[PDB]
Design a protein around this nucleic acid. Structure first.
Lengths: 85, 125
DNA sequence: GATTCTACGTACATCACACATTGTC
DNA sequence: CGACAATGTGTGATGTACGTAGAAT
């Protein structure tokens, strides 16, 4: 319950790799731990900004400002497009 | 279209581990879904470069560890892999990592009471 | 050791709606 | 400023999609 489901993480990893490729199980476990820790990293930064801006609800723009502050800049712009709902 | 890959409820649980989090918009789990997906993609490719550098067809943990240690955007991971402000924030992140609560915590017990009272069909409202 | 495959068994998604939240006045 | 109004999100119970656990290839 402390990490993301492993089947979905592993399938996402497969989508990035050729069909002939293989993935160690230890690598799958490490990858799922890494993504859960990345989530908590960005969430802590977004919460820092929301406290600094006297807000209590966490929104997408807060997440993206956090991710930009954390160096994942090249992630932001398509995620901005994904936001439109 | 909007039937997502990974579960949103799990992202919410992982978020709620931070005690400085009160309300989570519906936008945030949907954003994090694709954010994590793209993160997986980048990290897997960065590690696959090293796997190819060892002429191997299998991705093992040491490949990911090398990929982590090569690039600074994943410096926060150095504590989890076997190996001027942003770095201080990374250490703040490490300190917050120790203080994580995954226990079911109620924040707006009024909403809880109303939910105990609301009319529910098949458990649904 | 790592993938497919099947059948369990779990945890995700879903609901309505009183007030917390927001930024605007 | 701090109140108005409008927009929006926390909260439990449950069926059922879906991830999990093992052998077998």
């Amino acid at each position: 319950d402390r990490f993301l489901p492993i089947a979905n993480v592993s399938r996402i990893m497969k989508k990035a790799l050729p069909a002939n490729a293989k993935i160690s199980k230890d690598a799958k476990e490490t990858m799922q731990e890494c993504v859960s820790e990345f989530i908590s990293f960005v969430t802590g930064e977004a919460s820092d900004k929301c406290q600094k801006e006297k807000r209590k609800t966490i929104n997408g723009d807060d997440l993206l400002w956090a991710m930009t502050t954390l160096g994942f800049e090249d992630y932001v712009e398509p995620l901005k497009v994904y936001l439109q709902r | 279209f909007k039937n997502h890959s990974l579960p949103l409820a799990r992202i919410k649980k992982i978020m709620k581990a931070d005690e400085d989090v009160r309300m989570i918009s519906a936008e945030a789990p949907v954003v994090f879904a694709r954010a994590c997906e793209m993160f997986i993609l980048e990290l897997t490719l960065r590690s696959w470069n090293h796997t190819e550098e060892n002429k191997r067809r299998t991705l093992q943990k040491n490949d990911i560890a090398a990929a982590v240690t090569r690039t600074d955007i994943f410096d926060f991971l150095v504590d989890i892999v076997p190996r001027m402000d942003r770095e201080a924030r990374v250490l703040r992140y490490r300190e917050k990592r120790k203080t994580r609560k995954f226990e079911k915590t109620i924040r707006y017990a009024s909403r809880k009471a109303y939910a105990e009272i609301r009319p529910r069909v098949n458990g649904r409202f």
